[PDB]
């Protein structure tokens, strides 16, 4: 099982009819998982997720690094992010967002659980946030979400 040869272009991702799930939300910084409608070509086992990161707090956030871990029977891959910083929210302009394509291979069709480590900085001040998400679409519906 691998995901090495899989790269799903952001622009190519169609929306599913599912609601985004909250992976992390603290101090105006929320990360949601947007489940793609389709699977990569030839990969019915891969759930394509558009991870969004939004900053609604008055302070800017930089050095944003998201990492994930999946059950041994699965494989998780994170494509490069659209960026690593989020400007402070400003009523005058649309919120600053970062998107990161995450791929999850679940060949055996088991229940999905995803751990993550969020790392970022406010100025030089470091932050490390860890968590577990277990709100995913039924594996049976992957590919036609």
């Amino acid at each position: 099982l691998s995901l090495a040869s899989i790269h799903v272009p952001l622009e190519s991702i169609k929306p599913s009819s599912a609601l985004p799930v909250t992976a992390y939300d603290k101090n105006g910084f929320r990360i949601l998982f947007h489940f793609a409608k389709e699977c990569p070509p030839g990969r019915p086992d891969v759930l394509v997720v558009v991870v969004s990161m939004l900053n609604m707090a008055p302070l800017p956030v930089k050095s944003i690094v998201l990492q994930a871990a999946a059950p041994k029977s699965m494989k998780v891959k994170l494509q490069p992010p659209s960026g690593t910083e989020l400007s402070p929210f400003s009523p005058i302009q649309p919120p600053a967002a970062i998107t990161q394509v995450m791929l999850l291979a679940n060949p055996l069709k088991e229940k999905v659980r995803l751990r993550y480590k969020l790392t970022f900085a406010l100025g030089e001040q470091l932050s490390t946030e860890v968590g577990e998400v277990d709100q995913f679409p039924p594996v049976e519906q992957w590919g036609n979400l």
């Binding site: 990492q67 994930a68 999946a70 059950p71 891959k77 994170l78 751990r115």
Partner: peptide, 8 residues
């Protein structure tokens, strides 16, 4: 039983 942390 999880795998290791993975990053871009």
């Amino acid at each position: 039983d999880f795998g290791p942390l993975v990053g871009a």
